[PDB]
């Protein structure tokens, strides 16, 4: 019985080993919007007689 306790404690220590890490790489990334129209900013000014 006391041997099972000693053997169990050793197995607990051996099981404390770490395997790996996992993380997401998202820094520096931004979403993109879509502009549907082109701004021209033009107006045609014409006289009444058209000259």
């Amino acid at each position: 019985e006391d041997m099972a306790k000693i053997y169990g404690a050793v197995a607990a220590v051996s099981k404390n080993v770490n395997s790996s890490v996992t993380y997401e790489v998202k820094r520096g990334t931004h979403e993109l919007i879509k502009v549907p129209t082109i701004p021209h900013n033009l107006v045609l000014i014409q006289s009444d007689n058209g000259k």
């Binding site: 169990g8 050793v10 197995a11 395997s19």
Partner: protein, 50 residues
């Protein structure tokens, strides 16, 4: 066809860690199954017929 199979059970083994440490845990359970953990003396002398 016939065969003789010895069934000592199934014991899971985990990889990546020391095997000897897992064997020690299973050793006490195996001894419990065979009834040899505690001090014993075998009496099988009367298990016979003529």
């Amino acid at each position: 066809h016939a065969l003789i199979k010895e069934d000592l059970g199934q014991w899971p083994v985990e990889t990546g860690i020391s095997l000897v440490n897992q064997a020690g845990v299973f050793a006490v359970q195996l001894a419990n199954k065979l009834g040899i953990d505690k001090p014993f003396v075998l009496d099988a002398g009367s298990n016979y017929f003529t």
